[PDB]
Amino acid sequence: AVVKCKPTSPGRRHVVKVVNPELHKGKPFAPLLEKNSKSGGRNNNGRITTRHIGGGHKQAYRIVDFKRNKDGIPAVVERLEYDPNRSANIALVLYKDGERRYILAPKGLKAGDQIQSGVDAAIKPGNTLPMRNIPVGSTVHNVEMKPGKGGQLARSAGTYVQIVARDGAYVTLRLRSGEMRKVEADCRATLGEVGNAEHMLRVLGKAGAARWRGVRPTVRGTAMNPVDHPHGGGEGRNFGKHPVTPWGVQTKGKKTRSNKRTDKFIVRRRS
RNA sequence: AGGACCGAACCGACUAAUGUUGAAAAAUUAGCGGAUGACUUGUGGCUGGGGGUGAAAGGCCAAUCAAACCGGGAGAUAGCU
RNA sequence: GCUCGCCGGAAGACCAAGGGUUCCUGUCCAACGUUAAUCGGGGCAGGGUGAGUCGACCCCUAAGGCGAGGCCGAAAGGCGUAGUCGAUGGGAAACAGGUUAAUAUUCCUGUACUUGGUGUUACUGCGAAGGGGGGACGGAGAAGGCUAUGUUGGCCGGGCGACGGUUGUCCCGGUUUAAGCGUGUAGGCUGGUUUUCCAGGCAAAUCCGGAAAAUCAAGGCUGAGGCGUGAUGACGAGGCACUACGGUGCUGAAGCAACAAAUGCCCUGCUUCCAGGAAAAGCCUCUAAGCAUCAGGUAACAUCAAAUCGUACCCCAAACCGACACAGGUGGUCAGGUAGAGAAUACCAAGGCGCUUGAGAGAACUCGGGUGAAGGAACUAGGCAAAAUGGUGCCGUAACUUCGGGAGAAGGCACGCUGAUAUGUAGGUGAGGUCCCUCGCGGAUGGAGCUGAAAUCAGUCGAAGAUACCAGCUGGCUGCAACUGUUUAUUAAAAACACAGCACUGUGCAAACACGAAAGUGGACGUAUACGGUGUGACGCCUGCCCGGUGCCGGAAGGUUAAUU
RNA sequence: AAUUCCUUGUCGGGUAAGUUCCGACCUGCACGAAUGGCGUAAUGAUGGCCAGGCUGUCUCCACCCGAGACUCAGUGAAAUU
RNA sequence: CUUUAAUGUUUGAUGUUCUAACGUUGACCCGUAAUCCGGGUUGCGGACAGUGUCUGGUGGGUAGUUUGACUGGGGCGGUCU
C-alpha cells in the first residue's frame, strides 16, 4: 500500500511510504544468501569510475533464479520477501522435490500460488516458457536475450515486456523504453508484470534517505572553479557555455551509441 | 515514530577579551551550536602529483598545494639588483 | 609529623597504542631541573619482570594485499584463478586469600577446571580437502525480574566526652567471604514421537529438505539470580609474646535481616519499524571413496605433556605525539555519600596533589573581577561587551498556518520550616501464620516490618523561601535561503554548498560512462518504476513570445571534397 | 529591490529630529518568468530596523578584592645595532 | 576498320544465401574439489564486427607558446615609412 506520513517534523512532510504487510517479517533463507560488500564506486585500480556512490545500510545478496530451468516440476510459493539489491520484491518458492529458490513477484501473486516452468506449462502469471509458445500481444517479464544465461530484461519494480510479433527464429518485442527489439525465439520469458508497481510513488522527503540507499551528494558543476569542470565558475552565476559533461561531452542531445555489432535486433529504437 | 525538542559526556568553533619573541608555529577564560544521527570514534586497509580527493573553498594530500616532498638534468636562464 | 587548601565522572584507579628500564635500593650533586637542592623521571653501581587457564604465537576468516599457472603489456611491469597471507572479528581452560624494597589470577596456601598423547578394560561401524545444521549477527523502544552498590536497623567490640548537656531513640568502627560442583527458578523459543515414500542437497546418504498416515499431549533446548556445598576454613576490628616501635608468631568476638537500586545481567530476548542488517573455521551430524575376528570410534580409570615470546614502570601524562619537565592533543574499563531530574553542579570519603623561584611593599598602568549615588543606549558603525531573564505545578497563551506548529508564546499565581489530617497517609515491598499441592526456588490467603510521596488546614521566622552553585530575556516589521546538516585545518559559517522533489538528455546489457596503451575492473552480480550526466532547488500559483546565430538532433537532390587508382 | 546611476526620488508611517527600516507610487539609467519568477507557515550562533526590560555602554567616572608592574636575593633571554 | 545481342572468360557494383576464417562478457564436458584461462562439443551471429597501417573531418579534453613600441606614470585614444 501507499501512505503519506504526517508533517510532525521537518523532512516528514512529503516523505511517502510503500507499506506491504504481505512481505516476510523475518530473516530470508540463508542457503540462498551470500557475501556482498559495498564498493564505493571504485575499481581494481582504486579510482572512482562512477560517482555518487558511498555508504548505505548493510545489504545481503539474494540468490535469485533468473533462468527458471527446473522444467516439469511445479512449485508453490511460501512468502514474499523484501530485497534491497533490487526495487522489486521476491517470493520464497518451494518445489515438489524439496528444493527452494528465489524469484521475482508478478503483479498479483500471493502465497500458495502454483507455478511451473518449461514448454508444457500453463499460461498464467508466474510461469516460464520459451517465447516460441507464448501468445502474441501478451505480457512477460524477466526476459532473456540469449538462450541459457538467464533473464536480463524487465527486472524492475513494475516493468514488463509485451510480445508483439513473430516471423521466424526471432520474436519482436516492445521494451518498457518503447524500443522495438527482436531476439531469438527460444529464450525464456515469465508471464505477467513484476509486482511492485507502487514503488515509483515512494517519496523520500529528506536527504538522509538518499544516504541510506548509498547515494552520495551530487554537486552541480556550475560553480566548480574551472579547473574541475568545463562549466567552471565566474563572478556570479554566468554559465555562458554549452552544457557539457566532464571530459568534454554535451549531455543534452549527443547520442553516444557506438556498438555497430548488432545492427540486426534494433527496429524502432525510441521516440 | 522523529535527518524532533531542552541539555552534559562526546564532535564542533559564532562572538568577545586576553595572549601576539604567547603556556601554545591558531590556544585559553566567559558564554555559544549540534547532540538516535547526512552523528561520532578506535584498529587496519585502498585511491599518488597534472594525479588523487573534494555536501566545492582552488580547500585537503605529513605545520608546505593555481599543481606535494626527495634526488637528478643543474653551476637551468637571469639584457635585472 | 600536626594543620589549612585543591580535584574527586578526576587533577583517582586498571590497560591498549606508544615509549623501552624512566621501575626498587644505596650512593653521588659538576651538568640537566627555568632558583637553591641533602631531592629528582639527573650521574655511577647493583637488584628487579616467574603463567597449561590473561595476552601473543596458534586455528579460521573480512575489507584488502601478494600471486604457481595463465591473460595482457616496447622493457620495467600490470590484473588475476587455484591457493597463500592479512584483525580492529569467531575459536578450550582460575577464583579467593596471603606475600617482595621492587613481580602476579604468573610465586605460596586452599579449592578447581580444560584440550590433547599414550596405556588398560568393556561395548562397537569407523572414515573427507565432500553434504547439511550451527556458528550467524540491524536500529529503536518497552517494561518485568535480579545483582554489583548503597542506606537504616539489629548484633559484636570499644567509648562517656578540653566548654553548657551527653548510660541514651547516644557516638565511633566492623558485620567480608570467590571460581567451581549440584539444584535449572523468574522467564524465552518450540508441538513431539514412530514408520513408509521422493525429480532436490554436483556422486551417495539413516542427517537436511519435502510428502502422505498413525499416535500422546507433555517433550526437549536456552537461561540471570537465589539456595546448598565450596568454608569446622580463610579474612577479620582488636589483643597477646618477641617488640632496634623496622616488624614478626599465636589469638582474634559479631560476620544477620529489611528497604532502595542501576546506563550492567537474564536480553545474540520480547515488541516494532525500514534503511532489511559480515564471512570461514572450531563444534554437532550425514554418509562416499575405502578399511572391518583390523585400523579407527565411544565410556571409565591410570599416566604424561600443555612448549616458545610478552608481563617491570608511565599510559588524559613531567615517561606517547607537540624542539621544553610545553596551560594543548590521546582510545577502552571501573563509576562511593548528601541535595538533585542527572555521568549537571556544589561540599566530601577512598585515594591523590598543592602545579621546581620565594620574600616584602600595597604607585601609575594593564589583565582578571565585585559594587554603585540620580539618569537609563544620550556611548557606538552596531545594545560590541556587560547586566538582566533563568526552575517545578496549576491558570492562561495572539496574527499567521503546510493545521503538525507558532508555544516554554507573551503574562499571572503559590514555592521555606513545625505540627496535624496519618505516633509515617496514599502507594510500593512483603515476613510469620493459615490453607492447597502434580510435596518445588510452588500457589493463595495473610498482612507484620521496612519504605515513602504528594495535598490541604493551622501555626511560625526572615528584607528576601525555585534563598547558594546550577538554571531561556521577550515582543514587533522585513530581506535571503525552505528546513536538519555541510565548507575555505591556521583571518571568510554565509544569502554560497548539499538537499528531498521537478525537468531535459543519454543509456536495450559485451549498456552509456569512467579507470586504464592492453587484458580487465567499477557501473552491477543491477536491466528503463534502472544507471549516468546537466540544470533547477521543499511545497503552493506559474514557468510567457522568438530556432536568425552557435551547438545538437535529422534528411536528400545537387555542388565541393582525402588517401588510394 | 542583495539589482535604482541622477538620489537622502515623492508621499505616508514611526522619532523632538530618521541618507538606514516598513508601507505604496513606477520616471525598470541596468528585474523577469528551471543560469527559474511571485509568494511561503516553520527554522536561523543568518542581514537590516523599531520597542519593553535591565545595565558603568555613556553623562563621569569612584572605591574595593586579586595577579603583574615597583623593591630585595638567585638563575638569566630577545629583536635591533 | 565504322556496328550490335545471349554466351566463354574478365573484373566492377547492388542484393540474396551459405560457412570454413573471425567473434561469442551463450549452454555443456575435461584439465579440476577453480564463475580466471585453455582445450573440446554444440548453439547463435558471421565475412559483419574488431584490430592494424594510410587518410579526411572533428577535437581547449590535454599540452607547448604568442598576445608590439613610443607614451609628460601606465592604460584608452593617437602615432610608427
Concatenate the DSSP letters of all residues of A21-51 into one string: TTB-SS---GGGEE------SB-TT--BSS-
Q: Which nucleotide is nearest to A7 (CA to C1')?
A: C404
Which positions in strand C are less than 7 Å from the protein's CB atoms? 62-65, 79-80, 132-138, 198-201, 208-211, 273-279, 402-405, 482-484, 496-501, 504-516, 520-523, 525-539, 550-554
Cα–Cα distance measured from residue A160 to residue A190, given in angstroms and rounded to the nearest whole number: 10
Specify the 3-state DSSP secondary structure of A72.
coil
Fold of A195-271: Ribosomal protein L2; domain 3 (4.10.950)
Q: Do domains A1-113 and A195-271 have the same CATH topology?
A: no
Cα–Cα distance measured from residue A41 to residue A38, given in angstroms and rounded to the nearest whole number: 9
Cα–Cα distance measured from residue A260 to residue A168, given in angstroms and rounded to the nearest whole number: 23
CA of A270 to C1' of C31 (A): 91
Half-sphere exposure of A208 (CA within 13 A, CB side): 4
Nearest to A222 by CA among A206, A236, A204: A236
CA of A35 to C1' of C270 (A): 29
Amino acid at A250: Q
Q: Which CATH class name applies to A1-113? A: mainly beta
**Cβ-Cβ contacts under 8 Å for A9 (sequence gap 6 or more):** none
Cα–Cα distance measured from residue A211 to residue A196, given in angstroms and rounded to the nearest whole number: 22
Half-sphere exposure of A117 (CA within 13 A, CB side): 19
Please state the length of chain A: 271
CA of A252 to C1' of E62 (A): 23
Protein contacts of strand E with Cβ less than 7 Å away: A 146-149, 169, 184, 230, 244, 247-248, 258-261, 263-264
At which residue does the C-alpha cell 501507499 appear?
A2
Annotated resolution, angstroms? 2.9
Cα–Cα distance measured from residue A6 to residue A72, given in angstroms and rounded to the nearest whole number: 50
Amino acid at A91: A
CA of A85 to C1' of C185 (A): 46
Burial class from Cβ neighbours inside 10 Å (0-12, 13-18, 19+) for residue A41 reads middle
Residue A10 CB closer than 7 angstroms to strand D? yes
**Sign of the dihedral defined by the CA atoms of residues A181, A186, A192, A198, in that order:** negative
Query: Per-domain residue ranges for chain A?
Result: 1-113, 117-194, 195-271
Which positions in strand D are less than 7 Å from the protein's CB atoms? 35-36, 42
Beta bridge pairs of residue A79: A92
Residue A236 CB closer than 7 angstroms to strand D? no
List % helix, strand, coil for chain A (3-state, nearest 5).
10, 25, 65
CB A110 within 8 A of CB A124: no
Cα–Cα distance measured from residue A209 to residue A83, given in angstroms and rounded to the nearest whole number: 17
Across A190-222, b (16+ Cβ under 10 Å) vs e yields: bbbbbbbeebeebebbeeeeebeebbeeeeebe
Beta bridge pairs of residue A16: A4, A203
Cα–Cα distance measured from residue A24 to residue A40, given in angstroms and rounded to the nearest whole number: 29
Cα–Cα distance measured from residue A140 to residue A126, given in angstroms and rounded to the nearest whole number: 9
Measuring CA to CA, how many Å separate A13 from each of A3, A4, A8, A152, A205? 12, 8, 7, 37, 7
Which positions in strand E are less than 7 Å from the protein's CB atoms? 26-28, 43-46, 48-50, 59-61
The CA radius of gyration of chain A, in Å to the nearest whole number, is 22
